[PDB]
Design a protein around this ligand. Sequence first.
Ligand SMILES: Nc1ncnc2c1ncn2[C@@H]1O[C@H](COP(=O)(O)OP(=O)(O)O)[C@@H](O)[C@H]1O
Ligand SMILES: Nc1ncnc2c1ncn2[C@@H]1O[C@H](COP(=O)(O)OP(=O)(O)O)[C@@H](O)[C@H]1O
Ligand SMILES: [Cl-]
Ligand SMILES: [Cl-]
Lengths: 304, 304
Amino acid sequence: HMENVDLVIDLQFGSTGKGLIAGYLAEKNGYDTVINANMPNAGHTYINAEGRKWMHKVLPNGIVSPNLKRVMLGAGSVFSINRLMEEIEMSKDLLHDKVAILIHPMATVLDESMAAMVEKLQRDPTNNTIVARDVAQYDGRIAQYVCTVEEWDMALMASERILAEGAQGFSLSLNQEFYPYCTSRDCTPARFLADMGIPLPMLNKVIGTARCHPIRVSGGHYPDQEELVRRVFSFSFIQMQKAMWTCQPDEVFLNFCNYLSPMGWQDIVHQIEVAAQSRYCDAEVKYLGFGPTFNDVELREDVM
Amino acid sequence: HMENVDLVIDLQFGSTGKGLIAGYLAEKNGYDTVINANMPNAGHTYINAEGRKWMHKVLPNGIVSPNLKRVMLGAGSVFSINRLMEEIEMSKDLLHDKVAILIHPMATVLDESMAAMVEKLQRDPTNNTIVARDVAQYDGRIAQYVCTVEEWDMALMASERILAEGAQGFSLSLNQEFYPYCTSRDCTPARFLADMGIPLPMLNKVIGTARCHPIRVSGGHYPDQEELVRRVFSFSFIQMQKAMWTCQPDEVFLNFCNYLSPMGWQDIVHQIEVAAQSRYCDAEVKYLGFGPTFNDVELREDVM
Ligand SMILES: Nc1ncnc2c1ncn2[C@@H]1O[C@H](COP(=O)(O)OP(=O)(O)O)[C@@H](O)[C@H]1O
Ligand SMILES: Nc1ncnc2c1ncn2[C@@H]1O[C@H](COP(=O)(O)OP(=O)(O)O)[C@@H](O)[C@H]1O
Ligand SMILES: [Cl-]
Ligand SMILES: [Cl-]
C-alpha cells in the first residue's frame, strides 16, 4: 500500500537521461504501475538490451516493465493527445488489454504549454476544453483513458509497485535560483508526487539522476561550473549539493560516464557522494550510465 | 536535520480552523521555524490562552511559538507586501531582533492572485515586478526579509523544529474532483512541502484538520453530504476518505466540535478514524476544537 513508489528525479538541468534509468528500473523491478506528470518536453529515451528505442514525451519510460498493469499520466501532465496516441500506438504490444492507461481527469490537454497550464489555472467554468475530464467528453481518443479522481486514487491504491517518473531537472525548478530561466514548476520530489497525486507515505525511494557534464537546453549556471541550443557544463558540486538538499535521493544514477576518463566520472561519483553527505543525504551513486542502453547501466559497486 | 517538520493541513473545504491548531502546536512544541506558502485568503485565526488574536493571511499562525527563530514565507507564497507589513507590525513583539523573517526569493508579490501566480509562471525575463527577489530590488519593505534560495535552504537546514502550515483545504485542490470550482493548486502535503521548498525527509508528521460540519466559502460537494457566501455541509465520510488517502495525516484535529452534541462530534471522531483506516491511514483524532482559542483545544483521549 505505502512505501512502494520509486521516484526517478533529475538532479541537474534535465538532460541526465532519466528515461534510461526509468526503463532500466522498470525492467529490473517490474512495476505494475508507471506514472509521470510530464509537461511538453524534448522527450525521454529508453533503449532496451534488444536495441528497441522508446522516445517518450508523454508516456512513462517505465511502460517497458514486464509486469505493466497501469500507465498513469498525472494531474500535472500537460500533453498533446496526438503525441499520446502516437506513443500508445508505438507501444501497442506493451499496452495490451491487461494494461490500463489512466489519464488523470485534471491533466491538461494541449491544443493541437504555458497557455495550456495557465488556462487550467484560470479555472474558467465555461472552458470545457482544457482538462482531460472535459476534453474526454467530445474527444473519444482520451475518453477510454480518462479516469475520475477516485479511479486515479484507486489505481494508486491497487498498485503493488510504482515507478514515478519526475520531469525535467532540479535546476530547471521554477523556485530554484535561475528564475525566470526555469520551467513553470519545481522539479523536486514533493512537486512530482503532488503532480501525480501520489500521497507522501507511498514514497519508497528517490532515484536521483545526474550527468557528469550537466546540459542545459540562455539560463544561467552554477559558479563552480563553466560551459565546455545545448550548453554542456562541467560538473557543479554546488548544483549537486542543492539538488541533494532538496531532492534527497536515496540512490543516484550517474549517467554519461562514458564521455569521461575513469578518473573523470569516478571523481564525480565521489563528488556527488560528498555533496549528498554535505546536505544530510545518505544518497549513494548506485547506477552508472555508460551509454544510452539498458546494457550500459552498470552497478557502481561492480565498476569502482 | 530530517523528520522535524510538522505540517498542518486541512482535510476538507479550508475553513477547519488550521490557524487554531497551528498556534496551539506552536505554543506546545515551540518550533524555532514556522513556514507556509499562503496565496491570498480570508485569513487564519489563532487565539492564545490570554485572548490575544492573530488573524493571518500571510504570516504563519505558528509565530506565537515561544522559541520562534525563523518565519518563512515559501516560494509558493502569493502575498501583498501591505498585508505582510501590517501582520509584522501587529506581531512586532514576537518578531524581534532574534526572529528572522525570510521571504523566499521566488515568492509572488501581489500588485497593490490569479494574475500574480500566472505572471510568475509566465517567467517574463523583463518582468522584475512579480517575484520577491525582484520586488526587493526597488521595495525596501521586503528587501530586509527576501533571502536567496541558498539562504532559504540553509534556514530550513538550521531549523531544529518546523511548523509548516498548509493552505486552504484538501477538497479545494486544483486536481480534486471539484475542478474548476477549486483553488489554483493542490492542497495536499506533497504540494505544501513543494511550495515551501521542504525536502520530503524533513517531514516528521502531518496534522490533518477537520470540522464536523465542513464549510465552503458555488463549488459542489460530496454525495454523502448535504448543505445545512458560506455553505455549511454535514460531515462527508467520502470527503474524509479522499482527504485521508491523499493527505495521510498522522494526527487529526477535529474542530468545531462545540457546534455538535457529544454523540454528533464523537460519531465524526469515529467516522474520521474509519475513513483513515479505510484509506491505509493510521491517523487518529488527537485534538478536538471546542472553540476558537488555545484553551478550547482538547486532547481527544481526555474528552472521549
Ligand atoms: N550514457 C549515455 N551516453 C550516451 N548517450 C546517452 C546516454 N544516456 C542516454 N543517452 C542518450 O542521450 C539522449 C538524451 O537522453 P533522454 O532520455 O532523452 O533525456 P532525459 O531523460 O534526461 O530527458 C537520448 O537520445 C539518449 O538515448
Ligand atoms: N471550534 C471553534 N468554534 C468556534 N469558532 C472557532 C473554532 N475554531 C476556530 N474558530 C473561529 O472560526 C473562524 C475560522 O477559522 P480560521 O482559522 O480563520 O480558518 P482556517 O484556518 O480554516 O482558514 C475564526 O474566526 C476562528 O476564530
Ligand atoms: Cl527498494
Ligand atoms: Cl512528533
